[PDB]
Design an enzyme around this catalytic site. Structure first.
Site, PDB file in Angstrom:
ATOM      1  N   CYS A 108      -8.812  54.993  16.182  1.00 46.13           N
ATOM      2  CA  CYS A 108     -10.078  54.654  15.792  1.00 46.13           C
ATOM      3  C   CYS A 108     -10.388  55.004  14.382  1.00 46.13           C
ATOM      4  O   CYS A 108     -10.776  56.397  14.605  1.00 46.13           O
ATOM      5  CB  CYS A 108     -11.220  54.502  16.678  1.00 46.13           C
ATOM      6  SG  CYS A 108     -12.721  54.348  15.915  1.00 46.13           S
ATOM      7  N   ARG A 111     -14.679  56.922  13.681  1.00 45.86           N
ATOM      8  CA  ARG A 111     -15.184  57.883  14.449  1.00 45.86           C
ATOM      9  C   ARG A 111     -16.089  59.045  13.964  1.00 45.86           C
ATOM     10  O   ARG A 111     -16.627  59.644  14.397  1.00 45.86           O
ATOM     11  CB  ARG A 111     -14.025  58.568  15.126  1.00 45.86           C
ATOM     12  CG  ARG A 111     -13.217  57.934  16.047  1.00 45.86           C
ATOM     13  CD  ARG A 111     -11.956  58.640  16.839  1.00 45.86           C
ATOM     14  NE  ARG A 111     -10.747  58.589  15.872  1.00 45.86           N
ATOM     15  CZ  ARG A 111      -9.768  59.450  15.859  1.00 45.86           C
ATOM     16  NH1 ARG A 111      -9.751  60.676  16.881  1.00 45.86           N
ATOM     17  NH2 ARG A 111      -8.714  59.539  15.040  1.00 45.86           N
ATOM     18  N   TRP A 280     -19.149  47.976  14.208  1.00 48.41           N
ATOM     19  CA  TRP A 280     -18.864  47.040  13.448  1.00 48.41           C
ATOM     20  C   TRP A 280     -17.530  46.861  12.718  1.00 48.41           C
ATOM     21  O   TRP A 280     -16.748  47.921  13.044  1.00 48.41           O
ATOM     22  CB  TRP A 280     -20.068  46.962  12.042  1.00 48.41           C
ATOM     23  CG  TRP A 280     -19.987  48.480  11.578  1.00 48.41           C
ATOM     24  CD1 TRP A 280     -19.147  48.930  10.641  1.00 48.41           C
ATOM     25  CD2 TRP A 280     -20.771  49.436  11.613  1.00 48.41           C
ATOM     26  NE1 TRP A 280     -19.207  50.111  10.285  1.00 48.41           N
ATOM     27  CE2 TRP A 280     -20.470  50.611  11.404  1.00 48.41           C
ATOM     28  CE3 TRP A 280     -21.696  49.596  12.944  1.00 48.41           C
ATOM     29  CZ2 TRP A 280     -20.789  51.730  11.194  1.00 48.41           C
ATOM     30  CZ3 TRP A 280     -22.371  51.049  12.926  1.00 48.41           C
ATOM     31  CH2 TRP A 280     -21.853  51.926  11.981  1.00 48.41           C
ATOM     32  N   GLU A 285      -9.399  44.077   9.129  1.00 46.33           N
ATOM     33  CA  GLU A 285      -9.252  43.519  10.520  1.00 46.33           C
ATOM     34  C   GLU A 285      -9.177  42.125  10.741  1.00 46.33           C
ATOM     35  O   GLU A 285      -8.498  41.339  11.086  1.00 46.33           O
ATOM     36  CB  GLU A 285     -10.380  44.253  11.597  1.00 46.33           C
ATOM     37  CG  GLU A 285     -10.089  45.617  11.933  1.00 46.33           C
ATOM     38  CD  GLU A 285     -11.149  46.205  12.816  1.00 46.33           C
ATOM     39  OE1 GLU A 285     -12.176  46.534  12.070  1.00 46.33           O
ATOM     40  OE2 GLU A 285     -11.000  46.133  13.960  1.00 46.33           O
TER      41      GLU A 285
HETATM   42  C1  HEM Z   1     -18.791  51.692  14.121  1.00 45.04           C
HETATM   43  C2  HEM Z   1     -17.839  50.956  13.291  1.00 45.04           C
HETATM   44  C3  HEM Z   1     -16.469  51.006  13.857  1.00 45.04           C
HETATM   45  C4  HEM Z   1     -15.271  50.802  13.008  1.00 45.04           C
HETATM   46  C5  HEM Z   1     -15.378  50.422  11.602  1.00 45.04           C
HETATM   47  C6  HEM Z   1     -13.983  50.934  13.765  1.00 45.04           C
HETATM   48  C7  HEM Z   1     -12.881  50.679  13.505  1.00 45.04           C
HETATM   49  C8  HEM Z   1     -11.762  50.467  14.206  1.00 45.04           C
HETATM   50  C9  HEM Z   1     -10.305  50.035  13.748  1.00 45.04           C
HETATM   51  C10 HEM Z   1     -10.018  49.386  12.374  1.00 45.04           C
HETATM   52  C11 HEM Z   1      -9.551  49.939  14.601  1.00 45.04           C
HETATM   53  C12 HEM Z   1      -8.320  49.544  14.725  1.00 45.04           C
HETATM   54  C13 HEM Z   1      -7.775  48.635  15.738  1.00 45.04           C
HETATM   55  C14 HEM Z   1      -7.315  47.199  14.985  1.00 45.04           C
HETATM   56  O1  HEM Z   1      -6.296  47.515  14.128  1.00 45.04           O
HETATM   57  O2  HEM Z   1      -7.782  46.034  15.049  1.00 45.04           O
HETATM   58  C15 HEM Z   1     -10.096  50.614  15.913  1.00 45.04           C
HETATM   59  C16 HEM Z   1      -9.789  50.961  17.134  1.00 45.04           C
HETATM   60  C17 HEM Z   1     -10.538  51.444  18.313  1.00 45.04           C
HETATM   61  N1  HEM Z   1     -11.735  51.720  18.272  1.00 45.04           N
HETATM   62 FE1  HEM Z   1     -13.180  51.812  16.586  1.00 45.04          FE
HETATM   63  N2  HEM Z   1     -14.517  51.174  15.084  1.00 45.04           N
HETATM   64  C18 HEM Z   1     -15.887  51.335  15.134  1.00 45.04           C
HETATM   65  C19 HEM Z   1     -16.611  51.779  16.278  1.00 45.04           C
HETATM   66  C20 HEM Z   1     -15.959  51.883  17.504  1.00 45.04           C
HETATM   67  C21 HEM Z   1     -16.629  52.337  18.664  1.00 45.04           C
HETATM   68  C22 HEM Z   1     -18.391  52.009  18.966  1.00 45.04           C
HETATM   69  C23 HEM Z   1     -15.933  52.440  19.731  1.00 45.04           C
HETATM   70  C24 HEM Z   1     -16.100  52.848  21.352  1.00 45.04           C
HETATM   71  C25 HEM Z   1     -17.263  53.409  21.678  1.00 45.04           C
HETATM   72  C26 HEM Z   1     -14.463  52.664  19.190  1.00 45.04           C
HETATM   73  C27 HEM Z   1     -13.407  52.807  20.106  1.00 45.04           C
HETATM   74  C28 HEM Z   1     -12.122  52.284  19.487  1.00 45.04           C
HETATM   75  C29 HEM Z   1     -11.072  52.242  20.443  1.00 45.04           C
HETATM   76  C30 HEM Z   1     -10.777  52.734  21.836  1.00 45.04           C
HETATM   77  C31 HEM Z   1      -9.844  51.747  19.493  1.00 45.04           C
HETATM   78  C32 HEM Z   1      -8.333  51.720  19.899  1.00 45.04           C
HETATM   79  C33 HEM Z   1      -8.297  50.261  20.253  1.00 45.04           C
HETATM   80  C34 HEM Z   1      -6.849  49.949  20.822  1.00 45.04           C
HETATM   81  O3  HEM Z   1      -6.052  50.880  20.863  1.00 45.04           O
HETATM   82  O4  HEM Z   1      -6.466  48.727  20.930  1.00 45.04           O
HETATM   83  N3  HEM Z   1     -14.678  52.167  17.952  1.00 45.04           N
HETATM   84  N4  HEM Z   1     -11.536  50.906  15.735  1.00 45.04           N
HETATM   85  C1  Q1T Z   2      -5.553  42.276  15.444  1.00 44.82           C
HETATM   86  N1  Q1T Z   2      -4.436  43.302  15.129  1.00 44.82           N
HETATM   87  C2  Q1T Z   2      -4.312  44.225  16.535  1.00 44.82           C
HETATM   88  C3  Q1T Z   2      -5.455  45.144  16.599  1.00 44.82           C
HETATM   89  N2  Q1T Z   2      -5.113  45.176  18.120  1.00 44.82           N
HETATM   90  C4  Q1T Z   2      -4.077  45.099  18.880  1.00 44.82           C
HETATM   91  C5  Q1T Z   2      -6.428  45.501  18.595  1.00 44.82           C
HETATM   92  C6  Q1T Z   2      -7.177  44.440  19.866  1.00 44.82           C
HETATM   93  C7  Q1T Z   2      -7.978  44.863  20.647  1.00 44.82           C
HETATM   94  C8  Q1T Z   2      -8.121  44.255  21.638  1.00 44.82           C
HETATM   95  N3  Q1T Z   2      -8.167  43.568  22.750  1.00 44.82           N
HETATM   96  C9  Q1T Z   2      -9.109  45.687  20.050  1.00 44.82           C
HETATM   97  C10 Q1T Z   2      -8.844  46.158  18.952  1.00 44.82           C
HETATM   98  C11 Q1T Z   2     -10.086  47.035  18.284  1.00 44.82           C
HETATM   99  C12 Q1T Z   2     -10.982  46.506  17.312  1.00 44.82           C
HETATM  100  C13 Q1T Z   2     -12.303  47.153  17.072  1.00 44.82           C
HETATM  101  C14 Q1T Z   2     -13.252  47.653  17.912  1.00 44.82           C
HETATM  102  C15 Q1T Z   2     -14.304  48.400  17.685  1.00 44.82           C
HETATM  103  C16 Q1T Z   2     -15.162  48.862  18.833  1.00 44.82           C
HETATM  104  C17 Q1T Z   2     -14.754  48.200  16.360  1.00 44.82           C
HETATM  105  C18 Q1T Z   2     -13.779  47.783  15.425  1.00 44.82           C
HETATM  106  N4  Q1T Z   2     -14.173  47.687  14.048  1.00 44.82           N
HETATM  107  N5  Q1T Z   2     -12.624  47.227  15.856  1.00 44.82           N
HETATM  108  C19 Q1T Z   2      -7.661  46.174  17.894  1.00 44.82           C
END
Ligand code: HEM
Ligand code: Q1T
Ligand code: HEM
Ligand code: Q1T
Ligand code: H4B
Ligand code: H4B
Ligand code: ZN
EC number: 1.14.13.39
Lengths: 404, 403
Positions: A108, A111, A280, A285
């Site tokens: 993420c 963070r 958000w 993404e």
């Molecule tokens: C507040 C704005 C936030 C932004 C901009 C953000 C951004 C991202 C992005 C860009 C990813 C990459 C996943 C992808 O490639 O689609 C990600 C993954 C992740 N985020 Fe964040 N996030 C945010 C908030 C949060 C919150 C509130 C949580 C949980 C409390 C969180 C937990 C996670 C976790 C666990 C992943 C890994 C998901 C996976 O491995 O599939 N995020 N986040």
């Molecule tokens: C779209 N490309 C692959 C990214 N992947 C595999 C992916 C799969 C799942 C699910 N289910 C969820 C995520 C995380 C996306 C996310 C989560 C949160 C809390 C915030 C944020 N900005 N993005 C990422």
């Protein structure tokens, strides 16, 4: 000098050492013979140590380690496990654990915001109908009319013998994916199986590129129940481009709220199988992955034709030019609609600030370079030049197998 | 255990079994992955690596177990027992160098691995001869813009002496002149080597694209300074196909990417001076060399000429300028008839390579963070491909700067 991973930033020349990784209890997928870092998906006595370790973490965070409340909370957990096999978290422990799990998530980039997470306790929930109310409440609160607020809703933990609480969808908001006669997909190919599952369970499907899926919610030892989200709770943003006037005519749209609902939240050995969380979006993404992946909406060729680019040769960089303007459209349209969003530059800069915060606070930050670096303009962002150490800490968000 | 490798765009799965041939350890342990890290932190064993390589060689030419094979294992054994080291046959060296490139996990151009011109320069005894060998390499490799992959191999390391070395990290580098006010004129990556040249009596210039001299070092001697004949250094001036003002920025880059500071290990033997070259992938010039904040850093400059909004990140001025700069490099090289490959073409060829390698060896060592280009990552097929990273021999390795 030090016998911890040495970590370098190649843009700035600076060095740090990660001592935090020493606190990792869990092995990852790598070994000295080979690196598997690019792979997306590679008890009584045991519970106690996890439990003891978490309570230790909690008391440190409020600075009462070694104290009488600390050793009494220990005694209280060890006793509760000894008589029932499980134990329960206090409210403020749950809040701390949810935040620490987010803080601990290596993939993420967002963070920097970890400390600011709204935790809704829903550990009282006793029906799939009740789950729906908690979820609607979460969406309402988290969406906040475009001014988005991070939140998580925590449903009851796994219980011995008794069956889990599960949200079958991967996100709270997902577009349907409809398999055609030709073999193509209308909508989102990512969501084909879940679309089929919703039908199997009696949803009357639509036939757009952007049909909001219903929720499939599963209470303990029951078949899942189907719930349609009230359209007004689901905020969307139509995509236009600030200067290419035809882009709006494409009919492309995305939803405001990224809410992951299929991950397991693990705290002190306790497993919360339904704990949907949301923040958000980072603009890439949507603009890069969701709209341009070959196996998603795949709109790159459509956009490049409209832009009048030479799609016959790679060396025109037509793919690059279309992806840029699509990402621009996503940003411009969310900004126009007053819906929170962050571009990949702002996001990565803020993540660099986060690494520095954590270097001082904890002596490191678990981080997955391939997931942290954005899918467009990688080396244009500071994280590209930042080496990173990846390891699993707990509390954690973990992948869990699909209920079916 | 054998790793399960998945392509997420196609849904296909392979199993890497080539990794079990890895005799060397990487930076990772089960507790923490150190993948994104750029640099790493007896006659019985030399003989074992020598036996293994000789076996590899005789397997390649499909003559394993033969008389020549056994006789060659005897030669190697005999030479090691008496001298503590041995020497390679030219044919074996040719095999080893090709196999080293094939095994290089950070290289996206390995589709080309069998096509490598190998110059044996192990009969070299002075810096002067090194310069000679280097000039012929440059002439051969450049071929008036029709680039051809080459490696020149200087004498191996020896227990009783200092190493043959090229001090320069590449055979062609632009000088980087440190200023009193801290700023850098020219290429900031080459400040240190520009300073070593000056100290060894080079008359500096005051340009952004001043081609450095080579510091060549014969064993246990001070390095000597050699100035490359301007006609040997093919360069390409940069212009843009639709932005007239771009050419006015006076940008240029050299045609030959020739790495000259890595060590080539074959069958336990080590070659500390063994420069190698192919041709550029356009992002190396347009994205990294020209747009890295710690390199020429030209993004803002180009963005302003495009009349973009520098004031905010969300206007994606950086992304836009970067795409034009990369297009300018591809256009310019194509215009000058100098070999170059864009990141889309390059990565498509690498996917075919993975596939060829899956059938030939049961896998292919790859470093995902290096294979995926620095712009438009997920727009290329390698982004969606899982990769296993590990160390096979023969290999290219980093080695300390010799000062
Ligand atoms: C507040 C704005 C936030 C932004 C901009 C953000 C951004 C991202 C992005 C860009 C990813 C990459 C996943 C992808 O490639 O689609 C990600 C993954 C992740 N985020 Fe964040 N996030 C945010 C908030 C949060 C919150 C509130 C949580 C949980 C409390 C969180 C937990 C996670 C976790 C666990 C992943 C890994 C998901 C996976 O491995 O599939 N995020 N986040
Ligand atoms: C779209 N490309 C692959 C990214 N992947 C595999 C992916 C799969 C799942 C699910 N289910 C969820 C995520 C995380 C996306 C996310 C989560 C949160 C809390 C915030 C944020 N900005 N993005 C990422
Ligand atoms: C033929 C055309 C070639 C192309 C297009 C190509 C492309 C590349 C690229 C893009 C990189 C990453 C470099 C960076 O991002 O800075 C790389 C690395 C590398 N290449 Fe190739 N290459 C080619 C030929 C060769 C040859 C002939 C050899 C050796 C015989 C070779 C060996 C290596 C090695 C050892 C690395 C790792 C460099 C390092 O660790 O710093 N390549 N190549
Ligand atoms: C700006 N990116 C540089 C990445 N680095 C550190 C880097 C360092 C060295 C060295 N020495 C060499 C390279 C690769 C240059 C190269 C080599 C070859 C054979 C082909 C090619 N197209 N580029 C890259
Ligand atoms: C094979 C590779 O691990 C896979 O495609 C990864 C690359 N990096 C990623 N990074 C993010 N943020 N999200 C992803 O889904 C992926 N996919
Ligand atoms: C820290 C990080 O590993 C480093 O910046 C790497 C990332 N990937 C790369 N990939 C290539 N091809 N060349 C590079 O220099 C780098 N740099
Ligand atoms: Zn690893």
């Amino acid at each position: 000098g030090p016998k911890f991973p040495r970590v370098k930033n190649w843009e700035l020349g600076s060095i740090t050492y990660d001592t935090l990784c020493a606190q990792s209890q869990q092995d990852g997928p790598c070994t000295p013979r080979r690196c598997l870092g690019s792979l997306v998906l590679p008890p009584a006595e045991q519970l106690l140590s996890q439990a003891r370790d978490f309570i230790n973490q909690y008391y440190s965070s409020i600075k009462r380690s070694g104290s009488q409340a600390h050793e009494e909370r220990l005694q209280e957990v060890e006793a509760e496990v000894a008589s029932t096999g499980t134990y329960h978290l206090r409210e403020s422990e749950l809040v701390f654990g949810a935040k620490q799990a987010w803080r601990n998530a290596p993939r993420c980039v967002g963070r920097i915001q970890w400390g600011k997470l709204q935790v809704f306790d829903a550990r009282d929930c006793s029906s799939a109908q009740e789950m729906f109310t908690y979820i609607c409440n979460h969406i309402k609160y988290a969406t906040n009319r475009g001014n988005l607020r991070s939140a998580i809703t925590v449903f009851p933990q796994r219980a011995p013998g008794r069956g889990d609480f599960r949200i079958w969808n991967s996100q709270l908001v997902r577009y349907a994916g409809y398999r055609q006669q030709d073999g193509s997909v209308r909508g989102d190919p990512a969501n084909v199986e879940i679309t089929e599952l919703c039908i199997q369970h009696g949803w009357t499907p639509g036939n757009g590129r952007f049909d909001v899926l219903p929720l499939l919610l599963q209470a303990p030892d029951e078949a899942p129940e189907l719930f349609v989200l009230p359209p007004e709770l689901v905020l969307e943003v139509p995509l236009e481009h600030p200067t290419l006037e035809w882009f709006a005519a494409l009919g492309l749209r995305w939803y405001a709220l990224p809410a992951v609902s299929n991950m397991l939240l693990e705290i002190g050995g306790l497993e919360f199988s339904a704990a949907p969380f949301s923040g958000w979006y980072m603009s890439t993404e949507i603009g890069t992955r969701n709209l341009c992946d070959p196996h998603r909406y795949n709109i790159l060729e459509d956009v490049a034709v409209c832009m009048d680019l030479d799609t016959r040769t790679t060396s025109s960089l037509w793919k690059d030019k279309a992806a840029v303007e699509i990402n621009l459209a996503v940003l411009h349209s969310f900004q126009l609609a007053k819906v929170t969003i962050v571009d990949h530059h702002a996001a990565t800069v803020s993540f660099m600030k986060h690494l520095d915060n954590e270097q001082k606070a904890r002596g490191g930050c678990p981080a997955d370079w391939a997931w942290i670096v954005p899918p467009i303009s990688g080396s244009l962002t500071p994280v590209f030049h930042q080496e990173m150490v990846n390891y699993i800490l707990s509390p954690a968000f973990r992948y869990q197998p699909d209920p079916w």
